[PDB]
C-alpha cells in the first residue's frame, strides 16, 4: 500500500526550470537520490511523469536497477527501442493506475516517486514518507512543488541531515512522515538510576544530524540539569559550568538558523578584534551597539574607572591579542609597536611550522582586569593542522551567555577560522567550543522555550570574496564576504542583562 517521494527543492518550493534542474550538478544529492530508491538492503519502482522522463540524459534514462513507470498519454512504446535484467519500461495512464500495475506486487518491494502535478497527485493518500533535500540557495523556477509548512518561514519531521555543499550550494536532507546475560545485570542499573528531562528540544525529529542541536540540547540540559544561581548583574542565572560544541566548516558555515543570527556585527567585531580597536564608539555608529551598554558613563563609573572616555574598553580583547603586556594609554593612542602581537605569531607559525603545538591566543592577562570595561568572556583559542592541510579551532570561554551571545560568539570564531584558513593557504575543518560557567538568564526562559519549537534549517556557506587580493589577515575588509543561502527563522527578542 505505502510509497515514498524524492524531492530536492529550493526553500520556496522550486524544482525545475525550462525542463531541467536549476542547480549546477550537486553530487552529494545524486548519491542520496540513488542510494535511497535503489535499496531494500541488497528491485524498486520509480514512477515519473512524461516531462520528468524528458529532462533526463539519453544514456542515463533507463534509470538503472529499478523499474521505471512513466505517467504519459502520448508516448508509450517509442520509449524503448530508443536499447540484462533491466525491466521493460512501462507507461501508466495515471498515478493511481501506476499503483494498480501490484501483476507487479512482490516483484518490487519499494516504489519511489521521482514530477510536479504528479506530486499533487501523490498527495491527493498514497505516501507516508517524503525524502526531501532542503536546498537553501534559491534559483528561478517555473515548475514549483505543491502545498508541510517550514522549508520557508501533515508530514512530520523525523530526520535532519547535517548540511552539505557542492558547487556553491548548501543543502541538507530531511524526512517527512504522515500523521540470562544482558538483562540479568539490570537489577543494579535499576537502582543507581534516576529517568525522563522532558522539556527537551525537538522530540518528534528522532534522527538529529543537524549540528545545531548541540546548542538546542545545550539549552534543555541547562534548564533541565542546571542550577539557579546569582550573578553580578542582578538577573537570575541557571548554570551547569562546562559544556562543549564542535562544528563542521568543511561544507557549510554554522550560522544559527534557529533564529536570525546577527551576522553583521559578529563580522564587524572580528574586524574590530583584528584591528585592535578599544573605542566602542568606532563600532556603535556602524550600527553595532552590542558594546554600547558596557562602556556608558554610568557603567565605567561602576567599574571604577572614572578616568575613561565613554567607549574605551581599555586593554580588552583584541588589544591583549595584538599588543600583550603593554601599558595601554587611550582609545586614540597608536599602539603599533608595543606589546606581544600574539596574533602575528600564530600565522607566521602556521605557514612554516604547522606541526607546532604553540598556536594560541590568550586574552587573559591577570595584571589587567580592573582596567577593562569587563574582563574577557571568550579568552583563549588554539589552532591545529593535520594530514589534509585542514585548519581546526578550539576557543575557550569563561562565561557563556546562551540566550544571546553564544549564538553570536559562535560565528565570530568559526568566521575567524575561515579567516585564518585562507591566509595560511588551507581548507577549514572544524571549530570547537569549550565553555566556563554555562548559564541562561531567567527572562530568557519563556523565549528560549519557544525557540525550541523550531527546526534547524540547512547552514549557509560563507565565502571569502577577493581571495587573491587578500594575502594577510588585515587585507580582510568588511566587504570581502558572501552570506549565501542563509534561511533564518525569526529573531527572538531576549533582553540583555546590564
Ligand X SMILES: NC(=O)C1=CN([C@@H]2O[C@H](COP(=O)(O)OP(=O)(O)OC[C@H]3O[C@@H](n4cnc5c(N)ncnc54)[C@H](OP(=O)(O)O)[C@@H]3O)[C@@H](O)[C@H]2O)C=CC1
Ligand Y SMILES: C#CCN(Cc1ccc2[nH]c(N)nc(=O)c2c1)c1ccc(C(=O)N[C@@H](CCC(=O)O)C(=O)O)cc1
Please pick, from the candidates 25, 88, 204, 232, the single residue that binds its own copies as defined by CB under 8 A.
232
Residue 48, interface with ligand X (CB under 6 A)?
yes
Question: Rounded to the nearest whole angstrom, what is the least distance from the CB of residue 326 to its own copies in the complex?
Answer: 9
Distance CA 391, CA 409 (A): 19
CA-closest candidate to residue 374, choices 320, 439, 454: 320
Consult the annotation and say whether 232 binds a ligand.
yes
Q: Is 260 annotated as a binding residue?
A: no
Q: Does 328 carry a binding-site annotation?
A: no
Binding of residue 25 to ligand UMP (CB under 6 A): no
Q: H-helix or E-strand containing 128?
A: strand 127-135
**Of residues 368-387, which lie at the interface with ligand UMP (CB under 6 A)?**
374-375, 377-378
312 binds, among ligand Y, ligand X, ligand FOL, none (CB under 5 to 8 A by kind): none
Residue 258 · residue 153 · CB < 8 Å: no
Q: Read out DSSP for 241-299?
A: --EEEEEE-SSS----SSS---HHHHHHHHHHHHHT--BTHHHHTTT--SSGGGS-HHH
C-alpha cell at 388: 589534509
One symbol per residue from 390 to 419: x for binding ligand UMP (CB under 6 A), - otherwise; what is it? ---------xxx---xx--x----------
By CB under 8 A, name the one of 307, 355, 468, 479 that touches its own copies. Answer: 355
Work out whether strand 90-91 and strand 66-71 pair parallel, antiparallel, or are unpaired: parallel
Q: Which residue's CB is nearer to ligand X, number 73 or number 181?
A: 73
Q: Which residues, at least 6 apart from 242, have a Cβ–Cβ distance to it below 8 Å?
A: 434, 435, 436, 438
Q: Is 401 in the site for ligand Y (CB under 6 A)?
A: yes
Say whether residue 94 binds ligand X (CB under 6 A). Answer: yes
Q: Map the footprint of ligand Y across residues 409-438, applying CB under 6 A.
A: 409
Among 43, 54, 56, 299, binds ligand FOL (CB under 6 A): 56
Q: Is 439 annotated as a binding residue?
A: yes
Which residues in 322-361 contact ligand UMP (CB under 6 A)? 357
Does 8 engage in binding with ligand FOL (CB under 6 A)? yes
Q: Which residues carry out catalysis?
A: 377
Broken C–N links (> 2.5 Å) in the chain, after residues: 42, 82, 83, 101, 102, 114, 124, 147, 153, 179, 194, 196
Q: Is residue 404 a contact point for ligand Y (CB under 6 A)? A: yes
Closest by CA to 136, choosing from 263, 253, 215, 36, is 253
Positive or negative: CA dihedral 296, 301, 302, 304: positive
C-alpha grid cell, residue 38: 535503489
Contact with its own copies (CB under 8 A): which of 1, 83, 85, 184?
184
Beta bridge partners of 131: 175
* Residue 7 binds ligand FOL, judged by CB under 6 A: yes
Nearest to 67 by CA among 82, 52, 85: 85
Residues 15-34 that bind ligand FOL (CB under 6 A): 21, 29-31, 33-34
> CA–CA separation, 266 vs 288, rounded Å?
9
Which residue in the set 12, 34, 65, 117 belongs to the binding site for ligand X (CB under 6 A)?
Answer: 117
Helix (H) / strand (E) containing 342 = helix 342-352
Reduced to 3 states (helix: H, G, I; strand: E, B; else coil), residue 173 is: strand
| Interactions with ligand X, residue window 130-149 (CB under 6 A) | 143
- For residue 149, say whether it is annotated as part of any ligand binding site: no
Q: Is 307 in the site for ligand UMP (CB under 6 A)?
A: no
Contact between 342 and its own copies per CB under 8 A: yes
Q: Does 405 count as an annotated binding residue? A: no
CB 91 within 8 A of CB 69: yes
String of contacts with its own copies for each residue 162-181, x by CB under 8 A: x----------x-x-x---x
Residue 142 annotated in ligand binding:
no
Window contacting ligand FOL (CB under 6 A); options: 59-67, 77-85, 88-96, 259-267: 59-67
100 binds, among ligand Y, ligand UMP, its own copies, none (CB under 5 to 8 A by kind): none
CB of 368 to ligand UMP, least distance (A): 14
Rounded to an integer, what distance in angstroms lies between the CA atom of residue 346 and that of residue 361? 8
If one asks whether residue 232 binds ligand Y (CB under 6 A), the answer comes out as: no
> Any known ligand binding at 384?
no
Q: Pick the binder of ligand Y from 145, 155, 291, 321 (CB under 6 A).
A: 291
Question: What is the separation of C-alpha 227 from the centre of its chain, rounded to a whole number of angstroms?
Answer: 29
Point out which residues pair with 129 in neighbouring strands: 4, 177
SS3 165: strand
CB of 235 to ligand Y, least distance (A): 8
Contact 303, 498 (CB under 8 A): no
Q: Indicate which single residue of 104, 139, 408, 481 sits in contact with ligand Y (rule: CB under 6 A).
A: 408
The CA angle 33-39-41, to the nearest 5 degrees, is 145
Q: How far is the CB of 497 from ligand Y (least distance, A)?
A: 4
Instruction: Count the neighbouring beta carbons within 10 Å of the beta carbon of residue 482.
Output: 12
407 by DSSP, 3-state: which? helix
Q: Is 104 annotated as a binding residue?
A: no
- Binding positions for dUMP: 232, 378, 397-401, 409, 439-441
Residues forming contacts to ligand X in the complex (CB under 6 A) are 7-9, 15-17, 19-21, 48-52, 55, 71-75, 94-95, 114-118, 121, 143
- Binding positions: 6, 8, 14-20, 29, 50-52, 71-74, 115-121, 133, 232, 378, 397-401, 409, 439-441
Amino acid at each position: 500500500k505505502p510509497v515514498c517521494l524524492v524531492v530536492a527543492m529550493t526553500p520556496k518550493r522550486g524544482i525545475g526550470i525550462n525542463n531541467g534542474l536549476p542547480w549546477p550538478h550537486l553530487t552529494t544529492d545524486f548519491k542520496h537520490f540513488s542510494r535511497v530508491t535503489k535499496t531494500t538492503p541488497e528491485f524498486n519502482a520509480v514512477v515519473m511523469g512524461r516531462k520528468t522522463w524528458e529532462s533526463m540524459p539519453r544514456k542515463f534514462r533507463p534509470l538503472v536497477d529499478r523499474l521505471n513507470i512513466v505517467v504519459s498519454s502520448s508516448l508509450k512504446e517509442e520509449d524503448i527501442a530508443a536499447k540484462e535484467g533491466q525491466q521493460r519500461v512501462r507507461v501508466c495512464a495515471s498515478l493511481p493506475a501506476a499503483l494498480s500495475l501490484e501483476e507487479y506486487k512482490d516483484s518490487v518491494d519499494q516504489i519511489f516517486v521521482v514530477g510536479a502535478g504528479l506530486y499533487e497527485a501523490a498527495l491527493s493518500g498514497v505516501a507516508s514518507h517524503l525524502y526531501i533535500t532542503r536546498v537553501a540557495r534559491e534559483f528561478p523556477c517555473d515548475v514549483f512543488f505543491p502545498a508541510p509548512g517550514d522549508d520557508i518561514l501533515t508530514y512530520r519531521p523525523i530526520f535532519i541531515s547535517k548540511t552539505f555543499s557542492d558547487n556553491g550550494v548548501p543543502y541538507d536532507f530531511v524526512v517527512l512522515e504522515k500523521r540470562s546475560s544482558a538483562a540479568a545485570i539490570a537489577p543494579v542499573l535499576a537502582w543507581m538510576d534516576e529517568d525522563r528531562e522532558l522539556i527537551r528540544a525537538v522530540p518528534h525529529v528522532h534522527f538529529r544530524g543537524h549540528e545545531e542541536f548541540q546548542y538546542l540540547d545545550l539549552i534543555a540540559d541547562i534548564i533541565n540539569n542546571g542550577r539557579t544561581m546569582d550573578d553580578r548583574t542582578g538577573v537570575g542565572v541557571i548554570s551547569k559550568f562546562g559544556c562543549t560544541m564542535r562544528y563542521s566548516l568543511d561544507q557549510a558555515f554554522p550560522l544559527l538558523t534557529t533564529k536570525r543570527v546577527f551576522w553583521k556585527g559578529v563580522l564587524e567585531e572580528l574586524l574590530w578584534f583584528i584591528r585592535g580597536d578599544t573605542n566602542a564608539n568606532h563600532l556603535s555608529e556602524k550600527g553595532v551597539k552590542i558594546w554600547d551598554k558596557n562602556v556608558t558613563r554610568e557603567f565605567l563609573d561602576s567599574r571604577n574607572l572614572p578616568h575613561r572616555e565613554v567607549g574605551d574598553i581599555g586593554p580588552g580583547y583584541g588589544f591583549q591579542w595584538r599588543h600583550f603586556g603593554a601599558a595601554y594609554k587611550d582609545m586614540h593612542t597608536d599602539y603599533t609597536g608595543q606589546g606581544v602581537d600574539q596574533l602575528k605569531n600564530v600565522i607566521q607559525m602556521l605557514r612554516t611550522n604547522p606541526t607546532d603545538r604553540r598556536m594560541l591566543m590568550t586574552a587573559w592577562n591577570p595584571a589587567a582586569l580592573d582596567e577593562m570595561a569587563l574582563p574577557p568572556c571568550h579568552l583563549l583559542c588554539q589552532f591545529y593542522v593535520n594530514d589534509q592541510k585542514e585548519l581546526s579551532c578550539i576557543m575557550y570561554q569563561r562565561s557563556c551567555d546562551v540566550g544571546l551571545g553564544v549564538p553570536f560568539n559562535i560565528a565570530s570564531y568559526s568566521l575567524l577560522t575561515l579567516m585564518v584558513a585562507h591566509v595560511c593557504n588551507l581548507k577549514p575543518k572544524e571549530f570547537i567550543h569549550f565553555m566556563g560557567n554555562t548559564h541562561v538568564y531567567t527572562n530568557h526562559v519563556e523565549a528560549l522555550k519557544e525557540q525550541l519549537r523550531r527546526e534547524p534549517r540547512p547552514f549557509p556557506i560563507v565565502n571569502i570574496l577577493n581571495k587573491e587580493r587578500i594575502k594577510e589577515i588585515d587585507d580582510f575588509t568588511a566587504e570581502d564576504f558572501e552570506v549565501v543561502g542563509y534561511v533564518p527563522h525569526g529573531r527572538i527578542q531576549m533582553e540583555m542583562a546590564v
